[PDB]
Amino acid sequence: CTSILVGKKASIDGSTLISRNDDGHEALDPQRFVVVNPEDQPRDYTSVISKVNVKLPDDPQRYTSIPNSILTNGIWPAAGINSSNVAMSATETITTNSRVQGLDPFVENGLGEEDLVTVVLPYVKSAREGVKRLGSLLEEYGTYEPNGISFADNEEVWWLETIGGHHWAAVRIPDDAYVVAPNRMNIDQFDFDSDDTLCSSDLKDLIDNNNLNPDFENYNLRHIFGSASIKDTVYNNPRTWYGQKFFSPDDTADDPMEQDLPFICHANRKISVEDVKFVLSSHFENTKYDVYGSGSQSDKTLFRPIGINRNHNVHILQIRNNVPTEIAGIHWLAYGANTFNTVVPFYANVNDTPVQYKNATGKFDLNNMYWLSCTTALLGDTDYDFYVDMRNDYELDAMSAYRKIQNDTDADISGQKDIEKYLENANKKLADVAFEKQNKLLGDMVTTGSNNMKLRYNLND
Amino acid sequence: CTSILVGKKASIDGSTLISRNDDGHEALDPQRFVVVNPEDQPRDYTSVISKVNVKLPDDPQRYTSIPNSILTNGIWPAAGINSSNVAMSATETITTNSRVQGLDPFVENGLGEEDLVTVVLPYVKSAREGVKRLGSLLEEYGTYEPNGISFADNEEVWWLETIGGHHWAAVRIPDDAYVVAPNRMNIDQFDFDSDDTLCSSDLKDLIDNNNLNPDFENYNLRHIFGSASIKDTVYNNPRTWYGQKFFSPDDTADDPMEQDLPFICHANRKISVEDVKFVLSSHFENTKYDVYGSGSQSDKTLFRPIGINRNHNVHILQIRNNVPTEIAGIHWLAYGANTFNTVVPFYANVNDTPVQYKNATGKFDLNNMYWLSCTTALLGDTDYDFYVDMRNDYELDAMSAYRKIQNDTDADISGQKDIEKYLENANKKLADVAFEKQNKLLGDMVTTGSNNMKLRYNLND
Amino acid sequence: CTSILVGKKASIDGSTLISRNDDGHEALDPQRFVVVNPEDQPRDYTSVISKVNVKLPDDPQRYTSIPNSILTNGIWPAAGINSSNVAMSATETITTNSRVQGLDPFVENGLGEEDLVTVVLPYVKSAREGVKRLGSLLEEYGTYEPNGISFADNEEVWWLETIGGHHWAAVRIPDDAYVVAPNRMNIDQFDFDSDDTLCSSDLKDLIDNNNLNPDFENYNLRHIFGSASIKDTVYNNPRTWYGQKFFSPDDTADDPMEQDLPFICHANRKISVEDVKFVLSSHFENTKYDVYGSGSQSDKTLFRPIGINRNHNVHILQIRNNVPTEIAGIHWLAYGANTFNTVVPFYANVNDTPVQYKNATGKFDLNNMYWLSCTTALLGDTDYDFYVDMRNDYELDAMSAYRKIQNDTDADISGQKDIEKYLENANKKLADVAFEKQNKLLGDMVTTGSNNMKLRYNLND
Amino acid sequence: CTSILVGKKASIDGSTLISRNDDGHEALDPQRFVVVNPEDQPRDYTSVISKVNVKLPDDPQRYTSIPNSILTNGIWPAAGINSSNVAMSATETITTNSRVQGLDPFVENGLGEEDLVTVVLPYVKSAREGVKRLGSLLEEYGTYEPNGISFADNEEVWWLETIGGHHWAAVRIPDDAYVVAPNRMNIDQFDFDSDDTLCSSDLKDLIDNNNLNPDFENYNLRHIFGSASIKDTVYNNPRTWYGQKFFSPDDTADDPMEQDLPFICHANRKISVEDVKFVLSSHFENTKYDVYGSGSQSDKTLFRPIGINRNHNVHILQIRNNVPTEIAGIHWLAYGANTFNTVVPFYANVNDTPVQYKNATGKFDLNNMYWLSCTTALLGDTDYDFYVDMRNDYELDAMSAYRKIQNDTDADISGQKDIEKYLENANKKLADVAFEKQNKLLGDMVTTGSNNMKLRYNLND
Structure with missing residues (x-):
């Protein structure tokens, strides 16, 4: 996984953003977009992996979620x-x-x-x-x-x-x-x-009493409790570095392997959802470490990219401040490798979710956005430079369409008698256009790609 | 397209210059040089692509233009x-x-x-x-x-x-x-x-009220309304960079991918028409990004050049200040990839245009300057280093001839009874010489090139 | 061509030097060393190429010259x-x-x-x-x-x-x-x-009245009247640069393509005839641009060298100040590509010239110094590193011999009753030695080179 | 040849050192170590090459020498x-x-x-x-x-x-x-x-009166009388540079081709005989110019090394100050390419020399140190990295043994009644152990090398 967090004064619109690529071990594992209504939430929870048993409060709130299709x-x-x-x-x-x-x-x-x-x-x-x-x-x-x-x-x-x-x-x-x-x-x-920190009440004593602190002064938690390994230099640090180079270019050096990059950073500009998705989809573009780029085979495969085949979902959770609370929560969502998808700004204030995002199963179904998005990214991976212009066109076209729907929906929120049905309609519109644009992209890739198959022989006349 | 603009104190002769390469999607698309007289101008205009219908004033001015042959x-x-x-x-x-x-x-x-x-x-x-x-x-x-x-x-x-x-x-x-x-x-x-700006009356409110501004201070319109994408670093910024390196070498760094190159620049010297055509014909000469150069295959093809196969026309529109207004307007014009053509200084104050520049159709005709110029540049592209010395000789020879005609024509303007007829004759002389020199160049290329064909076997005696 | 000029306080001996490689279009074109006596100078001159007719004064002075054999x-x-x-x-x-x-x-x-x-x-x-x-x-x-x-x-x-x-x-x-x-x-x-400049009486007016000056301040004639082209960066500027790097290493940067290298320079030492010949024979030694060096194929062939196959003659004209006027003028001369020849210090105060330098025709004759020198340089070109040590030995040996003859001839000038015959005899001695050493060099090259022919098979015993 | 000189305050032991590699044209030419007693010194000397005849004084001193075996x-x-x-x-x-x-x-x-x-x-x-x-x-x-x-x-x-x-x-x-x-x-x-210079009484006049001085100020003899050629940059200057980098690393730049490296230098430490032999045996170790190193074929062969196949002898002549005059003079000596030999500290105060160093003839004889040393160095050259560890072990072991014999011999010098017999015995011990160690080295090289011959096929069991 890769996570990006943005405070409310750091965003372009005064929202808070928390985001993550939900990466798995296997490349594909179908995801669903699901609202858990209180009546469907367990009071007596038992996990599958660890069999931990947790009694839960009897007053759960409704929430959005991205559960696995296969349980x-x-x-x-x-x-x-x-x-x-x-x-x-x-x-x-x-x-x-x-x-x-x-x-x-x-x-x-x-x-x-x-x-x-x-x-x-x-x-x-x-x-x-x-x-x-x-x-x-x-x-x-x-x-x-x-x-x-x-x-x-x-x-x-x-x-x-x-x-x-x-x-x-x-x-x-x-x-x-x-x-x-x-x-x-x-x-x-x-x-x-x-006042801006919280921790186990015994954490300082744990450190002080057991010789855990490697530093001569002060407390650095990852120095104490974490790692600074050789594997960190290729699996982890370059992702931090690339993100910080993008947002804080004048404050960030040119060593992707650096073990002491800052945690908290300050960007040279305010941050958009588009910015966050770019970094979460990245593969060290314009460096020798880009697997789709011009570097040597060893350089191209040295670093773990952020966008990756095993992106199962990407979510950008936005709590807005420029709107009434009933439309403040936006659950941006996409599926599959992030190179060929777009995040869709779903309203979280709903009781149900759109069919193209809700109904993935273990059966391959290209009417579903998980399987369609994965298929698109795989084809794109086979010849990235060939497909990237269509990809870029699609990103702008799709994100523009989503924002038009969001802006129109936001603008008419006052006086709505049934907010959840109003927003479910908006989410249906968003999912419908997201599917149409994803499908059109794959179609365009298949049509143009078929012209460039190895198995071809044309008369040039 | 690539555009170059030059203010009246920035030019070598005190003229204003605005210029553009008119690039298409397809490499070839025949162009015509046409004066639209007022009687030929529509009053009820409907476009082909969008079907927009615009009622126009009944007092249009005569103007030069470069319409497509195929409509x-x-x-x-x-x-x-x-x-x-x-x-x-x-x-x-x-x-x-x-x-x-x-x-x-x-x-x-x-x-x-x-x-x-x-x-x-x-x-x-x-x-x-x-x-x-x-x-x-x-x-x-x-x-x-x-x-x-x-x-x-x-x-x-x-x-x-x-x-x-x-x-x-x-x-x-x-x-x-x-x-x-x-x-x-x-x-x-x-x-x-x-005093130097104009815009939509609501533009500032549009920005302020909709959280469009990514910057902590001030307003940068392309930051707000434009792009700074990965594709920009290879498709766009290097062209800006190469031009600025040519005109402002001491104010320009060595990163062609730079996203915040200045819009407005100040050159270290006054700018000639020859300078503008050079930049508009360029392909990153003397860098590893020159497709005709010594770089790796990847470096040679990384950046979009300025001179390019799909240059349909290039125009440099010059409004002079060192002459009477009847000869102030010069519509410099050439066709096809800019590597093997020359811009010709047509006087704009005319009622009709020269046949070799006016009459291209969809039928291939080497008596026409569109087809002749494209043919020359295609041949030149097959072995640029072999043909470039003839190209360079031709550029100097042709531009010298055009300026002699312009200088002679300018010198004798006073007392002319029919200015348009006088200037049409000058334009005819210009087009005649332009064709003869373009044709001679292609002939020299074909003659020398034929000696170096793959399909050859000579006895070296 | 390449020219080198040296003022009288800049030379090692207080002489003035002007020099040039007389390069042609064809590699070979036989040259002669000829004194034109007044009776043989035309009074009614007509050129062959332009048919210009020039009436000349009836009192021409005797002069040395290097006419083409083929007229x-x-x-x-x-x-x-x-x-x-x-x-x-x-x-x-x-x-x-x-x-x-x-x-x-x-x-x-x-x-x-x-x-x-x-x-x-x-x-x-x-x-x-x-x-x-x-x-x-x-x-x-x-x-x-x-x-x-x-x-x-x-x-x-x-x-x-x-x-x-x-x-x-x-x-x-x-x-x-x-x-x-x-x-x-x-x-x-x-x-x-x-007082150090002369020009057309109208030159400043030509510039000022016709907007020719590209600079904001002052007058730079090559900015105004010359070129700063892409071809200049490979054909011209590197030659200037290499010469300036040799004479003014601490005042010269590391960019051979520089368009604004100074015209007038000041060396870090006084300049010898040997120095001038070295630069006039050079091919970017100890850089990647040396065609005989270790660079890539593209780097080795990027720049036009100074020594070159089409050096037809090289002359260094020296007017000495440490001697009587009758021996002040020295017409240093060599033929063919400058890599395998030496300049010979012929006294200019003579009525005729040595036969080996005077008698080239279009018929190949290795008893003539033009054809002998060309042959030597061609053989040397086939394996420069193999032949360069013999070349270097020959240069020192031959130049030492010439200077001994010059020093002896200078020393005994006093009391000579017939100066021109005395100096013609000295020139004959110089030319004879020059031929013997050029011939011995070629012989040594042929003998050693023959041992290293591809067409060989030796028993190593 | 390469020479290294060391003043008495610059050496680690307060001795003076003068040294040279005696390099020939052919790789091998047998050398002898010979004391010329006064009775065998010519009074009427005639050379072979020039036939110069020199009458010599009748009171010559005894001296050590290294004459050719073949006269x-x-x-x-x-x-x-x-x-x-x-x-x-x-x-x-x-x-x-x-x-x-x-x-x-x-x-x-x-x-x-x-x-x-x-x-x-x-x-x-x-x-x-x-x-x-x-x-x-x-x-x-x-x-x-x-x-x-x-x-x-x-x-x-x-x-x-x-x-x-x-x-x-x-x-x-x-x-x-x-x-x-x-x-x-x-x-x-x-x-x-x-007082630190001597020269021809007319040297300054020779320079001043014949315009030989290229410099504006002062007298630099190699500027005046020597060379600064292209060949110097590869044949000569890098050897000077490598030595100065070794002894004066902080005062020496990184350009081996430099024409104005100082003549007189000051090291950052006192200099040992071992140091001098290292430099005299060197081949640009740890640079790309090392023929046995990792550089390109052109870089590996660009410079003439100091240790070289045609080292016929190497001598380090030491006049010591920490001992009585009877043992002050040490004629350190080795034969053949310096990569696989060791200098042996022979006392010069003797009437005869050890047989393994004296008696080489034109007949190959591996009982003689000239032929044995040459054989060792040739074998070593065929796979330097394979043999260098044995070489290094041998150098330390042999030099240690020589120093032990020298220290013991020096310590027991007082009261020796027949100094030449005593020191001839010491030289015999030195030559005996030098031969035994040279032979053991070659034996170890032959034994290990034979295991790694191309002509092999082993069962790996």
Whole structure:
């Protein structure tokens, strides 16, 4: 996974943004877009992977989610927005080290990414409450994974990282800041006296009493609890670097392998949803590390890209401030490798979701946006430079259409007697056009690509 | 397309210059040089592509133009000078973004490049009037394209960019400045209250009220309304860079991909017509990005060149100040890929145009300068280093001959009873010499090239 | 061609030097060394190429010259020294531009390089007079070429450049300066009011009244009247650069393509005849642009070298100051590609020339120094690194022998009753030694080279 | 040849050192180590090459020498130490130029390297006397070669360079300085009136009166009398550079081709015999110019190395100051390419020399150190990286053994009644162990090398 967080003064429109590429082990694994209404939310939750049992409150809020179609390994809801307009994305797998694992080992029957959104998001009314509830659950039940989790509301953005079996720490992203986070523990300098941080009450004592701190002064959590490995230099750091080079070019050097890139950053401009999707779809464009570029075979394959074949979904959760609360929550969503898709700005304030995004199964179905988007990206991958101009045209055309629908829908919100049905209609329009444009793109690729097949022989007359 | 604009204090002779390569999608599409006399100008205009219907004033001025020979997609007049010595070239296709398109979408039955010179140029008596008339027409009829348009008279040079379906902005190029503009929105820092700017009356409100401004301070129009994409770094920015490196070498860095190259520039010397044609014919000479050069296959093909196979016409519209107004307007013109042609200084103050430039059809005819020039450049392309010395000789020889004719014609203008007849004779001499020299060049290329054919076997004795 | 000029305080011996490689279009064209006595000089001169007819004074001075053996295209005397010890070399083909050619076109029945030494040198008694006479002749008869011409006497060195059909400018080279000049207009910053300059009486008015000056301040003649083309960057500028790097290493940058290298330079040491011949024989040694070096095929062939297959003759005209006037004038001379020859210091104060240097015809004859020198350089070209050590040995040995003869001849000049016969005998000794050493070199090359033929098979025992 | 000189305050042990690689034209030419006792020194000397006849004093001193085994071209004694503990090495072939050769040509029946040690060394009692005697002989007999000669005693080190047929100059190396000298004239800035210089009484007048000085200020002898050729940049300067980079790394730039490297240098540490042998055995290790290294074929063969196949002998003549005069003179000696040999510290105060170093003939004999050393170096050359570890082990082991014998012999010197017999015994021990270790090295190379022959096929079991 790759995550990007944006505070409310750092965005172009004064919204908060939290985002993540939900990457899996296998390239394809069908995803669904689903609203969990309170009556369908469990009160007695048991996980599939760890068999952890968690009793949940009897007053869950409605929330959007992105569950797996195939439930063999559990729900894997990934991310969503609840009816209090709180957003959560879980998780970004991060790193750990043997010194802390020796003190607080993973808990085999603890919580995992399979579970976190389901057991936290419906029960909180702010990003800070989300942080605190997750922290409480880690302390009580433990975890078997090293994870990073984002929370947001219309005011604040938070990042929580889990530490060993039971510990955790969290930082409030400054209003004017952004973060790019790869699969590596991210939190750096950490002030135990700040109102903008939260952590296990015993975290400082854990560090101080067990010789965990490698630094001569102060506390840097990823120095203490995380990694700075050779694998980090190719799997993780270059993704952080590319994102920071894009947003903060004058503050970022030219070494993608750098182990001490800042966590919290300040961009040279305000950030759009389009900007976030670009970075989340990137593959080191205009460097020798671009697998689609001009570099040597070894340079082209040295770094893990951000856009990747195993992007299962990408979500950008936006809590807006320039609108009434009933339309503040936007669950931007796309499926498959991010090179040939577009995120669609779904209104979260709905009781159901559009069929092309809801109904993927394990059966290949090109009427569904998961399978259609994956198919498009695979074809594109076979000759990127050949298809990229159609891709670029489609991105502009599709995003323009989505924003027109959003702007029209926003403009007529006042006086609507049935808000959820009004917004379900808008989401249906968005999904309909998203499918039409995705399908037209693939059609154009197939038509032009067929002209350039190896299996050809034309008379040039 | 690529456009170059030069203010009256920036030129070597105190003229204003506006220029453009009129590039198409297909490599070849025959062009004509045509004077539209008032009786030939429509009053009830309907476009072919969009079916926009525009009622026009009953007092059109005579103007030069470069219409397509084949009218399947409409007239496509490209550029010309009217009898008030106002010059106009439309268009440079530029860029846009999804945020502004979502607010002011393209108008499918609006105006386009097919139409603009025809509906603007005959009805204005200054460059500034051209800007205001085009702005008004965009508001009334809308547009379905993102375009840049140049205007000039003997005093001022203006650049207008269209924004969404109805909006626009324009900048007066300072007298001592030049601009190089590729297929990307160009206007940068923009002062709404400046004497040097014009725009939609609601443009500032559009920006402020809809969170369009990505910058913490001030207004940069292409930041707001344009693009800074990966495709821009290879398709657009290097053309700007190469031109600026030529004119302002000490003010320009060494990164062709730079997204924030200045719009308005100041050269280290005064600019000649020869200079403008050089840049408009260029292909990154003396860099690794020259397709005819020594670079790797990938470097040689990375950037879109300025001179290119699909140059249909190139025009440099010059309004001179060192002469009587009856000879001030010069419509410099050439056809086909700019590597093997020369611009000819046709006097615009005429009622008809020379046969070798006027009469191209869809039938291949090497007595016509469109077909002859294209044929020459295609042959030249097959072995550029072999043919370039003949090319260079021809350029000097031809331009010298044109300037001798211009100088002689200018010198004898006083007392001429029929100016249009006098200048038509001068244009006939110009076209006759242009054809003879183009033909001699192709002949020399064929003669020398035939000696170097693959299909040869010589006894070396 | 390439020319090198050296003022009297810039040379190692206090002489003035003007020099040129007389390069042709064809690789080989036999040259002769000939003294034109007054009785053999035409009074009614008609050229072959242009059919210009020039009545000449009835009191011509004796002069040395280097006429073509084959007179199909006229005499082409190239360079010489007259009996007033005035030296002249004509010409260095330079460049022009279409703006000045449009105002003052070439004159087809004018003077050319075929003619200039013949019609100027016999009639002047100083370098300054030479400049003024040529200037006058250009005004009277015009010219059909863009040319640079050098003049010298024992005090001054001048460089004249022709501009259009009739105009010209000339600069006196400072005593302590040198110039390296390729096939490009050279004169830069120009002070009309200086005693060190001469020009067309109307030159400033021509510039001022016709908008010819591209610069904001001052007058740079090659900016105004010359070229700064892409072809200049590979054909011309690197030759200037290499020469300046050799003489002025600390004042010269590392860009051979530089368009604004200075005209007038100051070396870090005094300049020898050996130095001048080295530069005139050079091929970018110790750079990637050396065709005999280690660079890529494209780099090795990118630049026109100074030593080249079509060096027909090389002459270094020296007017000495450390001796009586009767031995002051030295016409240093060699033939063929400069890589495998040596310049021989012929006394100019003679009535006839040595047979091995005088008698070339169109019939191949290896007893003649033109054909012998060409043959040597061609063989050397086939494996330069294999033959270069013998070449280097030969250069030192031959130049040492020439200087011994010169030193001996100079030392015994006092009391010689018949100076011309004394010096003709010295020249015969020089030419005889030159032939013997050239022949021994070729013999050594043939003997060693034959051992390394491809057509070989040796038993290694 | 390559020569290294070290003043008495620059050495690690307070000795003076003069050294040279005696390189020939053919790779192999057998050398002998011979003491010439006074009874066998000619009084009526005639050379073989030039047939010069020199009457010599009747009181020659005993001296060591390194004559050729094959006397076809004369004795070629190379270098030695006489019984006054004066050292001399002759010669380093240097360069000249045509301007000085034109004034003072080579003398065909003069003295040469064949002769110099023989006619100078036996008759002088200080280095300064050596300089003066050689100077006198050059004036009396002339020379046919350009040569550099080193002299030393326990106080001073001198370098003499011959200039033309009769002239010469010499510089005393400062006590704290060193010199590295290749086959190029070396003496730079020169003070005629200094006690540290000697020269032809007319040298300054020769320069001043014949315009030989190329510099604006002062006198640099190699500027005046030497070369700065293209061949110098590859044959000579890189050897100087590599030595200066080794001894003076912080004072030496990174351009091996530099023409104005200093003559006199100051190292950053005191210099050992081991250091001198390293530089004299070098082949640009750890640069791309190392023929045994990783550079391109052209880079690997661009420069002449210091260690080379045609090293016939290497000698380091040491006059020590930390011991009684009876053991001050050490004639360090090795044979063959310096990559696979070691210098052995023979005491010079002997009447005869060890058989393994004395008795080489034209017949191949592996019991002799000339033929054994050459054989070792040839085998090593066939796979340097394969054999270099054995080479390195052998160098340390052998030099350690020599030093132990030297230290023991030095320590027991007092009271030895027959000094020559005592030191001949020491030299015998040295030669015996040198042979045993050279032979063991070759044996180890043959044993390991045979396992890695191309002509092999092993079962890997």
